[PDB]
Amino acid sequence: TLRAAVFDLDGVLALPAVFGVLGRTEEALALPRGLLNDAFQKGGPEGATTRLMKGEITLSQWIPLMEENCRKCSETAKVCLPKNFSIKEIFDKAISARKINRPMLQAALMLRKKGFTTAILTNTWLDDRAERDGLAQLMCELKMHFDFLIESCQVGMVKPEPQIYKFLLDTLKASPSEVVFLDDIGANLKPARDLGMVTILVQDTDTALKELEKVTGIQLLNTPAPLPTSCNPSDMSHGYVTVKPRVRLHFVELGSGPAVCLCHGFPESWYSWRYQIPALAQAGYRVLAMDMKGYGESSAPPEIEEYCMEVLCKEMVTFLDKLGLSQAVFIGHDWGGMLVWYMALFYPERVRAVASLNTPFIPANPNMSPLESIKANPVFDYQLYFQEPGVAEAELEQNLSRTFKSLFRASDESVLSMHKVCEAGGLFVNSPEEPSLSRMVTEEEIQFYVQQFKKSGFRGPLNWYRNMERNWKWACKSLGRKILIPALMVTAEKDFVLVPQMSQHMEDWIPHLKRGHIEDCGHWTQMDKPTEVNQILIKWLDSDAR
């Protein structure tokens, strides 16, 4: 019974295969058949290519050895190579063209999810070309999805030599019969077959995948659309910045490029962005996913005034100051979306671009108290219950697993009334003691939130709602301003509190505003519809945030 799957890189996990470009160049240049593929394999196990694949020499050192082999091969076949012939140009283009074979990666991901140990086994080189980064990026994206990556140039062994196979078996800690081995080269497949391993000669992906599902007994072809890559908390880079004597802000950091600061809502975590972090980093951004003040590993002082928008924004400015960032794009959800609009209004010089999920920008009415405005809409009545210090804390901290299981549900999974909460005596009245698990979250994901809220509880989080008068007074100073920096408003059809129609007049204050809209999406936007969120954010980032 199989428990490990092994994939080659060239022609298996990545396409078009770099090997096939030798035959393509020949046909394109009307050269004798196999001329380039012959110069490539010249000398066999003692030749330039084997030395390159074993790591004896780098790619830049092999280029002149390949050029000389091409001269020797054209001499024997009695022909002449063109004027502007370049091996570097041919390989630069072939490497650049080669992309991840998405269905093969999906099959490998599915096998690992079901408990398989997966590995990439590849004959590769030490790339020192000026353009080496493109391959480095490709290898990085791929490797993180597998238990092992075995490169010939790092182990000093090469396929089809039998040592690399016994080495593969040793790293897998499995007997040959427990291993499936996929390769596009028959000769390289041969020693694994001869050892007792299940083998698949890969030509077209579809047939290779049919052979793979037949032998593993796991459906890999025509499978439902997979969720985006998530985050394992213990595998992240964790960052800590003291913004003032009693306040430190924690964040998770991934990627390179323009800084993108993700600001969660209530009662959340940096982890609420788990499906966005790998996707935004892969799209070419440096993601900083915050634990907002009052949450997770960030400081949670008790004082109400420590959570007014003025203080929170000032601290986010200091956070950038301390990290040495002149700007960041600010993306917020719920209370984080409110912070992000005020960052744009008060510190436009520090905001590269602004995006909000669900939270609209609504200007302060200076002729009406916020308490009056909130009372007009019965949708916000539950926030009156959050006003009295200690009341909501006691109920929300009573049973954490119940709190999060009840809150984090899709639009059709509602378990909480969320109307007449302040008049029924609680948020959890006529709510199950043991809610079912939502289709949005695993038990493990709920337990992460439970573990985070064990440190500071709900006081700091609830304080974000206790500054209505202070926030309103501050917001009134900005009434003559407009938001003229790049801005995105993302509405969620089924958020019944932060309704899409609340965003309707935003163009009056943000004339250049761009929009996104997600259908059949509830309040917990990022985990409800992760694929669409990522699609919307990446598209806007690439067009408006550089």
Ligand X SMILES: Cn1cc(-c2ccc3c(c2)[C@@](C)(Cc2ccccc2)C(=O)N3)cn1
Annotated binding site: 8, 10, 122-123, 184, 382
CB proximity list for 169: less than 8 A, separation 6 or greater: 175, 176, 179, 195
Answer for which of 44, 82, 224, 324 binds a copy of itself (CB under 8 A) is 324
In sequence order, the β-bridge partners of residue 251 are 239, 290
- What does 298 bind: a copy of itself, ligand X, none (CB cut-off 5 to 8 Å by kind)? none
d(C-alpha 153, C-alpha 155), whole Å:
6
249 three-class SS: strand
- What does 271 bind: ligand X, a copy of itself, none (CB cut-off 5 to 8 Å by kind)? none
In sequence order, the β-bridge partners of residue 137 are none
Instruction: Please indicate whether residue 523 is annotated as part of the active site.
Output: yes
d(C-alpha 182, C-alpha 50), whole Å:
21
Stretch that binds ligand X, among 52-60, 226-234, 408-416, 463-471 (CB under 6 A): 463-471
User: Which residues, numbered 359-418, are part of the site for a copy of itself (CB under 8 A)?
Assistant: none
Residue 498 CB, nearest approach to a copy of itself (Å): 25
257 three-class SS: coil
Active-site option among 250, 264, 333, 523: 523
Residue 483 is a binding residue for ligand X (CB under 6 A)? no
Nearest to 470 by CA among 337, 263, 304, 302: 304
Stretch that binds a copy of itself, among 1-9, 479-487, 492-500, 521-529 (CB under 8 A): 479-487
Task: Determine whether 184 is exposed, middle or buried from the number of CB atoms within 10 Å of its CB (0-12, 13-18, 19+).
Answer: buried
User: Which residues, numbered 44-73, are part of the site for a copy of itself (CB under 8 A)?
Assistant: 51, 55-58, 60-61
Instruction: Please indicate whether residue 271 is annotated as part of the active site.
Output: no
- In one-letter notation, the amino acid at residue 501 is Q
- What does 128 bind: ligand X, a copy of itself, none (CB cut-off 5 to 8 Å by kind)? a copy of itself
Residue 498 CB, nearest approach to ligand X (Å): 9
From first CA to last CA, the distance across the chain in angstroms is 50
Residue 499 is a binding residue for ligand X (CB under 6 A)? no
289 three-class SS: strand
- What does 374 bind: ligand X, a copy of itself, none (CB cut-off 5 to 8 Å by kind)? ligand X
User: Which residues, numbered 234-293, are part of the site for ligand X (CB under 6 A)?
Assistant: none
- Binding site for substrate: residue ranges? 382
Alpha helices in 257-399 (DSSP H): 277-282, 309-323, 335-346, 370-376, 391-398
To which residue do tokens 């593993």 refer? 216
Residue 219 CB, nearest approach to ligand X (Å): 47
User: Which residues, numbered 338-397, are part of the site for ligand X (CB under 6 A)?
Assistant: 338, 362, 364, 370, 373-374, 377, 380, 383
Answer for which of 475, 489, 518, 545 binds ligand X (CB under 6 A) is 475
d(C-alpha 461, C-alpha 393), whole Å:
9
Answer for which of 136, 227, 368, 394 binds a copy of itself (CB under 8 A) is 136
Answer for which of 403, 463, 467, 491 binds ligand X (CB under 6 A) is 467
Instruction: Please indicate whether residue 465 is annotated as part of the active site.
Output: yes
Kindly state the tokens that stand for 533: 């969120």
Kindly state the tokens that stand for 486: 């790049």
Site track for ligand X across 419-458, x = CB under 6 A: ----------------------------------------
d(C-alpha 31, C-alpha 26), whole Å:
5
d(C-alpha 230, C-alpha 317), whole Å:
28
d(C-alpha 200, C-alpha 186), whole Å:
9
CA atoms within 13 A on the CB side of 356: 25
Residue 481 is a binding residue for a copy of itself (CB under 8 A)? yes
Answer for which of 127, 306, 495, 532 binds a copy of itself (CB under 8 A) is 127
Binding site for ligand X (CB under 6 A): 338, 362, 364, 370, 373-374, 377, 380, 383, 467-468, 471-472, 475
Known catalytic residues are 334, 465, 523
